[PDB]
Amino acid sequence: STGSATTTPIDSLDDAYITPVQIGTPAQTLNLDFDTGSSDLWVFSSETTASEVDGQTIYTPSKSTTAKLLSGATWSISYGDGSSSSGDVYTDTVSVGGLTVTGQAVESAKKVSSSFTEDSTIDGLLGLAFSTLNTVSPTQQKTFFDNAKASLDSPVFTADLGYHAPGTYNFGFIDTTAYTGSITYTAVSTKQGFWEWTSTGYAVGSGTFKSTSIDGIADTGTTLLYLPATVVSAYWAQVSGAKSSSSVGGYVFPCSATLPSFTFGVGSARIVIPGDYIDFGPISTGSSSCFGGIQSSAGIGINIFGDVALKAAFVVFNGATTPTLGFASK
Numbered sequence: 001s002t003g004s005a006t007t008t009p010i011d012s013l014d015d016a017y018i019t020p021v022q023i024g025t026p027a028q029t030l031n032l033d034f035d036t037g038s039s040d041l042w043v044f045s046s047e048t049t050a051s052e053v054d055g056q057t058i059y060t061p062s063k064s065t066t067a068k069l070l071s072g073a074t075w076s077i078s079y080g081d082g083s084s085s086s087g088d089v090y091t092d093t094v095s096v097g098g099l100t101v102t103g104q105a106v107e108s109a110k111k112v113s114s115s116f117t118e119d120s121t122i123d124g125l126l127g128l129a130f131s132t133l134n135t136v137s138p139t140q141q142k143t144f145f146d147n148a149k150a151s152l153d154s155p156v157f158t159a160d161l162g163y164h165a166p167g168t169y170n171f172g173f174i175d176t177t178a179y180t181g182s183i184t185y186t187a188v189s190t191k192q193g194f195w196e197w198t199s200t201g202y203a204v205g206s207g208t209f210k211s212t213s214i215d216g217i218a219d220t221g222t223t224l225l226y227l228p229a230t231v232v233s234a235y236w237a238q239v240s241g242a243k244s245s246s247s248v249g250g251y252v253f254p255c256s257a258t259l260p261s262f263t264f265g266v267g268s269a270r271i272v273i274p275g276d277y278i279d280f281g282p283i284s285t286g287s288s289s290c291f292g293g294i295q296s297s298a299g300i301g302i303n304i305f306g307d308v309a310l311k312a313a314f315v316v317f318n319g320a321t322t323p324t325l326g327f328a329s330k
């Protein structure tokens with residue numbers, strides 16, 4: 001089997017991406033944030049504290065003839081950005097782009113933190129990291145991809161995120177028309193539960209490439225690119241007036257700037273992030289200070305190849321017995 005679903009930016013700045021997902025019988029379609037940095041499929045629901053729901057579409061398990069309460073199971077997750085959610089668990093039929101998994105754990109939120117409530121465009125998350133990170137207790141549950149894997153034509157999924165435009169998540173096949181040149185594959189460590197790999201270096205604009213190992217994770221659920229302070233300083237030094245602002249919470253730059261590109265290495269291959277991808281717009285409405293899309297990972301504890309990086313590539317998440325990651329230009 002295969003599946004193919006369109007993923008769409010939530011706003012004009014690509015602050016996150018949503019993909020429609022069918023849950024239950026009859027189908028209830030929710031727009032979920034596909035997140036290769038976590039491993040829980042959780043949704044706003046009829047059980048979510050009413051004051052914490054503001055415009056999201058909810059899953060109502062009592063209206064699904066295939067929903068079953070997973071007795072005694074609870075979940076609770078805290079994300080790197082400080083957000084969180086928790087609740088109980090159903091199993092139900094979940095379909096993405098024509099690919100159906102029966103008996104998928106659907107984690108129903110009883111509580112969500114303010115940033116979730118405040119984002120009316122995202123009805124939940126669909127985790128695509130390794131199932132070892134799944135938070136369901138006392139019996140850990142599998143991700144949608146892990147459940148689908150055996151049925152897929154090939155044990156892979158691909159992320160093809162757009163810049164200020166829709167893109168695609170495919171399951172079970174590699175669309176050879178969706179990228180240019182060749183896909184370069186690189187080793188993955190699953191030791192921390194992530195799609196963790198090592199970039200071979202970087203360049204800023206038309207500058208020379210610096211060969212240096214940068215360990216990080218391919219994370220579709222993180223918006224920005226988080227790299228070591230040395231790398232990030234080298235990038236922003238090429239932008240007149242750019243500065244790190246403690247009060248704003250990262251590098252900002254004059255909105256009048258034309259940003260340089262940023263290149264990262266995948267083995268001997270190179271992925272180029274155009275400068276415009278690194279502009280996240282005014283820090284507040286009407287401001288002439290703009291927020292940068294490349295930020296320091298110092299104090300995160302890990303480097304994160306988030307959407308800013310991934311959207312410049314066609315990315316293969318190869319879930320074979322020894323997982324690997326592939327990157328192509330597009």
Ligand SMILES: Cc1oc2ncn(CCCN(C)C)c(=N)c2c1C
Nearest residue numbers: 015016079081083115119221222223
């Ligand atoms: C205006 C805005 O800026 C954002 N940045 C990251 N995200 C992603 C947050 C992911 N986290 C909850 C685990 C957003 N959802 C978002 C919105 C909305």
